Amino acid sequence: PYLRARGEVFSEIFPIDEAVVRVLVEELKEAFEKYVANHKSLRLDRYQLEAVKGTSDPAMLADTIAYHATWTVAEKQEILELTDLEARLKKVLGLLSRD
Amino acid sequence: PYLRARGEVFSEIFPIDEAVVRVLVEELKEAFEKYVANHKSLRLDRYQL
Incomplete structure (x- = not known):
């Protein structure tokens, strides 16, 4: 410590379909x-969630709604590593249905 | 080798209408x-598309 990393550019998933x-x-x-x-x-x-509107990327909202609930943050890490837009959405919706 | 073929019949039917x-x-x-x-x-x- 203190930790540093040569990270990368913004790796996002585009709003597709x-x-x-x-x-x-x-x-x-x-x-x-x-x-x-x-x-x-x-x-x-x-x-x-409604405070952010200019970036209407569904990954942004999928990570915001998941943040708003209190399941385990390890799943939030995994959904941050997910590359599928609706598998993020299905994961948040499924955890919300479980809640 | 080398690769070489021979086309025999050019079968292609274009449907009318x-x-x-x-x-x-x-x-x-x-x-x-x-x-x-x-x-x-x-x-x-x-x-x-």
Whole structure:
């Protein structure tokens, strides 16, 4: 320590196949909104998800909604390493359904 | 070796009334869009076709 690394450029996944992706983001936002309005244990508002709108990349929202819930952060690391846009969305929606 | 072939019959049938073939192409495009409609990891920018 202190740790340093010669990291790389922004490695993102592009919003591809907007139809199914927006559909699954809507389903994820439905599951997340009932997560917020049902799980009294968290009560986290859409002030870090709806606060970001210029970068409407569904990976950004998939990582934001996953952040808003309190399952294990190891799965957040794995979803940060995921390369599939909706497998991120399916992973967050599945963990929200489990919650 | 070396590689060398010999074409014998140039079999290629062009169906008359290509609009019917284009309608079948549209049907196959619709089926491919239906296959794309369920993907969670096999998404692709299919609109460039």
